Design a protein around this ligand. Sequence first.
Ligand SMILES: [Zn+2]
Ligand SMILES: [Zn+2]
Ligand SMILES: [Zn+2]
Length: 178
Amino acid sequence: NSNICEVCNKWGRLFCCDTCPRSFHEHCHIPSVEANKNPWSCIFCRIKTIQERCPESQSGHQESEVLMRQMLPEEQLKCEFLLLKVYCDSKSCFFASEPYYNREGSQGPQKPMWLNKVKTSLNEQMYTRVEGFVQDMRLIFHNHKEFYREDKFTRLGIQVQDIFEKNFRNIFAIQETS
Ligand SMILES: [Zn+2]
Ligand SMILES: [Zn+2]
Ligand SMILES: [Zn+2]
């Protein structure tokens, strides 16, 4: 196994996947690494199994159909994995914890949102459709862009949204378009 967390790239108290060489901090993996379970397989491996069991699941889909899916166990896992992919980028730090807003010439968003809040919401099974999770994720970056206006810091929201969107299209097998 790797000797650094797959998500944050640091060493520490690491749990190793039995079916692949990746390793994780307890609360870096999503869901948090399970108490017992020998052997244990990471989210990466669980996602690869879904694909392998239903090869046609990789055929293109329309975003509108994906959003309307109910959050059955496979969709729950796909959203957990998508969230984890965002935490894998170091720029996610800006979006992880609860924000506050006090900048001359700007007003804070009406509905603040952050990654740890989406993570708690997934853990608590608060989303009934994929659309609820995707809407909160896109709201994180939209709030950032509107608040930071012409400050160059706005770019961090564009960057981390691009990671989210590329991974959304991959994980949910969105039909490729020009
Ligand atoms: Zn970690
Ligand atoms: Zn694995
Ligand atoms: Zn099949």
